[PDB]
Design a protein around this nucleic acid. Sequence first.
RNA 1: GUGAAAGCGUGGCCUAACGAUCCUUUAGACCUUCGGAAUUCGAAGCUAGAGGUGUCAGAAAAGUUACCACAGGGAUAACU
RNA 2: CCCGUCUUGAAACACGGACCAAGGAGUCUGACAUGUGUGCGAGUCAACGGGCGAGUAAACCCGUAAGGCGUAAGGAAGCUGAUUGGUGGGAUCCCCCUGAGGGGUGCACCGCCGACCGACCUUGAUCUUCUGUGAAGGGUUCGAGUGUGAGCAUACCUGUCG
RNA 3: GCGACCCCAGGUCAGGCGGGACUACCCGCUGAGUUUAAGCAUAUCAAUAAGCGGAGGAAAAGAAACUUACAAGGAUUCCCCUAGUAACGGCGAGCGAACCGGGAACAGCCCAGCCUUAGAAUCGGGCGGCUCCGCCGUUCGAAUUGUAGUCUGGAGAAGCGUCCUCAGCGGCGGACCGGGCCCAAGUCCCCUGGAAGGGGGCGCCAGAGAGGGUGAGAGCCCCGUUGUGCCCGGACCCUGUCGCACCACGAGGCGCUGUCUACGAGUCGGGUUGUUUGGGAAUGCAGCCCAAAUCGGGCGGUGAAUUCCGUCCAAGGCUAAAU
Lengths: 200, 147, 98, 50
Amino acid sequence: MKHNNVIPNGHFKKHWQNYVRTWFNQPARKTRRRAARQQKAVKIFPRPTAGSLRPIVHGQTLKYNMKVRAGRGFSLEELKAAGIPKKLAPTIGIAVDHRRRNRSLEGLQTNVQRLKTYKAKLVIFPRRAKKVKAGDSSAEELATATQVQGSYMPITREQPAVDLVKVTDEMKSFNAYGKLRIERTNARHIGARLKRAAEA
Amino acid sequence: TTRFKKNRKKRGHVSAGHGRVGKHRKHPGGRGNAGGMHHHRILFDKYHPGYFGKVGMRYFHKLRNKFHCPTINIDNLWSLVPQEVKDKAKSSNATAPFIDVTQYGYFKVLGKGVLPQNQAVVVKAKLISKNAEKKIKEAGGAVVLTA
Amino acid sequence: QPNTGLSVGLNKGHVVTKKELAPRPSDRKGKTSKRVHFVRSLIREVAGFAPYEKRITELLKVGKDKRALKVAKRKLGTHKRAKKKREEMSNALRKMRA
Amino acid sequence: RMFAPTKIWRRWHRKIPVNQKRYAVASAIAASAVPSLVLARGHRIESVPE
RNA sequence: GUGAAAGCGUGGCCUAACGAUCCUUUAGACCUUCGGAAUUCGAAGCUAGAGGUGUCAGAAAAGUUACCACAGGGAUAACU
RNA sequence: CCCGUCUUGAAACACGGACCAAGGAGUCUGACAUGUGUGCGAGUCAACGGGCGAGUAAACCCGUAAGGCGUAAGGAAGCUGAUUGGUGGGAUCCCCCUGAGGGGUGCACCGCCGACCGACCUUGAUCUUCUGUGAAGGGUUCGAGUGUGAGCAUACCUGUCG
RNA sequence: GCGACCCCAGGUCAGGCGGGACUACCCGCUGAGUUUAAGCAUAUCAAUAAGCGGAGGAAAAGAAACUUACAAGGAUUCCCCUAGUAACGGCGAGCGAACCGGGAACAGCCCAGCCUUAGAAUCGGGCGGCUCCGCCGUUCGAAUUGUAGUCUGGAGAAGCGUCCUCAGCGGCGGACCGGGCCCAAGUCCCCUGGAAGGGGGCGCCAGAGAGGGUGAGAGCCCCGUUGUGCCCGGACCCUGUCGCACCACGAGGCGCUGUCUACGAGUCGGGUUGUUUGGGAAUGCAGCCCAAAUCGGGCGGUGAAUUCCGUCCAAGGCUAAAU
Ligand SMILES: [K+]
Ligand SMILES: [K+]
Ligand SMILES: [K+]
Ligand SMILES: [K+]
Ligand SMILES: [K+]
Ligand SMILES: [K+]
Ligand SMILES: [K+]
Ligand SMILES: [K+]
Ligand SMILES: [K+]
Ligand SMILES: [K+]
Ligand SMILES: [K+]
Ligand SMILES: [K+]
Ligand SMILES: [K+]
Ligand SMILES: [K+]
Ligand SMILES: [K+]
Ligand SMILES: [K+]
Ligand SMILES: [K+]
Ligand SMILES: [Mg+2]
Ligand SMILES: [Mg+2]
Ligand SMILES: [Mg+2]
Ligand SMILES: [Mg+2]
Ligand SMILES: [Mg+2]
Ligand SMILES: [Mg+2]
Ligand SMILES: [Mg+2]
Ligand SMILES: [Mg+2]
Ligand SMILES: [Mg+2]
């Protein structure tokens, strides 16, 4: 070792040459996955190629709680609120997740509205052609039925907007930094304050 | 590019540029960072002060997400406002633009630099520094706390 | 308690209308039917008590509650299970006395 | 055995920035419009109308 | 501290008399942390010393080989 | 005086070399670094993947609040978080006169000294949820900081290291 | 002495199953040192090589006794990032994950236990039939020390309403795969050559100028190549249509309930020892000792006590795809 260089820490002391993974098959993998997707689309025709509907869920942890993404499946509470029996939802293209809990009204209401939109946009063929049942669609709707290729219900964020508002005296007399400092102090000293209150 | 390698220029010069006396042997000073305290001590001390020893407390299973806190300076707040909103704010002095820095991925607002002259700005953020709040108040704006 | 809407202090976080969790069958994991309790009581009558349970009962009869808890902790491994076992022995002793 | 036997994990491919690729494409398209350059590249364009 | 005072005193009239990392241990704060929330033990941190490396810029270390082996050295002995 | 080599010193009573043909030794890869070329620029990088497409391992296109690096630092940590300079030299340019002249201009870089952020110390009017805030005022202390960004990608030589 | 059962013994008894072979990937066990640390013992090499076993076309894993602390995600697997990071380390040499986030693919389920008792409703063998991968009849046997059915925590049982859903067959095609047959154009004139497939001239085909052969650089001499057409066979799976009977006892779906609501033990957990891990007052595994509970139990990355809070439900089992 010589000169002023960063201290090296290369992890190459084992038989690493026997565990090298190359990517010469990357185009082949892409082609194989595309072929599988095409075969699946042909198989499930006329069902949408994007797959079953998924719920809207929040991101985990403080880093992503402002983000909205797709969850595994709709909760039992959401299905009950939307009037869709849980045993029927999977058969009509709705994913079901019996594990997800509903802690707030906003998420439950959002997913219920999503399910209602899907129901409004859903067309169901009868099990037997000559027999029409409660959940089946009319012949006119069935005739104009096609396979949807892309995502039929994109999960998108409401883009930010900067509006002009009046600055009132109440806002001009608010000490944000002082509020933050006092809240931090209260959080730090809650235990001591409770102990003193209990003692006295 | 082999044809540009200097060993090609050294073909026919015996030592290949590594000297007749010293030569190019396998590991004359040990492997890797060997001898950091004994025969490579001068190099470590002069170029890598602080290398040896330990300081501070440990933190088992430390997750960086709970420490996430992007910051933006007040001198960059105006750049977030779209051009049409900037024009509207310039035209009308009875209202101020309302910038939610959280929608742009910022948690805390710091107080480096200055704002546009004679422009009131309403800023909403999770946290703010005392200087940033003072500058916003002086500009005629206000600060709103969110989460 | 609802979130304050602040990022610091007590009850911090984004403001949402909190919803009580819907009841689910898993709320009864620690409970069992009356038949299971009856069967366990009958089998306890048939099979009696283990030697260390008898030792704990003797210690409680003498009045050495601390020694009984120490013996229970040594036998079972944890303070919580030792406390539970000592309480059960005390209940059995109370039933015997009455 | 040869010295330093060749291995498959040699860096065969290159990752050129998209902007530079587009620059090169635009330059080639512009050069295709210069008759002198087209002649200089070996094409017989003496009879093309324009 | 001393002297009336100027002033002198940050060890010995001057030129030698001594010691890193890691660990342990002591002193200091109404100090920081134990990461779901509190209190208390315990533990972990911050600043300054102490336990030592005398091969003294600081491995943890007994012989024998005539049964012997290898890489070298005329940088080095045993002739001329 | 016989070349090659080690050597203070080789024509050496120093070692290799009987002769010829062919083969024969600083490479590839990963992490950095300076330098240079190229693109863009407070941004930069589509090749994880997706849409396709020379009927196609290429080329082309695609970044939603994705991610990496950069865009803010100082503290073990709790935590706090850049008030936006002055001055001596100095390139170029503009005026008066033709002296090694005078005036204005004063980028790059260098020297010196302030100011701001943070660790530590010190300091304390007013408010305040009583432990927080911070008018004024600081320091022979400490920093890989600030004071109108300079990075990201990529190519090659060279250097350290596995 | 007979009979019933239990345990066991002999059968070339009737009918079945198993051993062994291969190595690129896969699963389990066992297990070094060279080497690096400029010496060396912990460490590193490496949870690797060697050794001993077990599968498939993939294996393994898999439906939370999970991740987290958020406005919360939601089986398993893999890729990018996290990250050369948290952590570990004679804190030396070195070593080094996971969660979130973005993508590929997606799929959920089966049991044990209280619940037929107006009768084991279950299953195997022989024999005889049938539209024979199975169905029916009869007869022996297994099984009450429990085969069927219901139930699996997401629930569920029971009761009452709603009238919402549920019952095959055969034909012809499409889709997938594997094959067979035919189909363009010069071998014109001159020269050199042993031989034109070379040079010059004159023509032609081209959705065919990929490639090969033939006496030298051959699109048009031959096989082929491009694009049509026709023909044959598998896979009984997916899909469209057509022809006929289409029976809701019963079982599910939805609503209600002052009733119940059964959930895996020498197992969890604890002490200690050894090994391993980034896992640090101890990450997993294993031996030995102790040894649970049901308003309870595991986890919440610093040991302990107290009070709360969050999250799941182990000690039984199956499961395609992304790799
Ligand atoms: K360097
Ligand atoms: K050199
Ligand atoms: K030399
Ligand atoms: K520590
Ligand atoms: K003195
Ligand atoms: K020494
Ligand atoms: K020896
Ligand atoms: K030599
Ligand atoms: K010689
Ligand atoms: K970016
Ligand atoms: K500090
Ligand atoms: K039978
Ligand atoms: K059963
Ligand atoms: K059960
Ligand atoms: K279970
Ligand atoms: K154990
Ligand atoms: K619990
Ligand atoms: Mg050297
Ligand atoms: Mg000392
Ligand atoms: Mg981002
Ligand atoms: Mg399997
Ligand atoms: Mg990084
Ligand atoms: Mg993920
Ligand atoms: Mg039979
Ligand atoms: Mg010839
Ligand atoms: Mg032909």
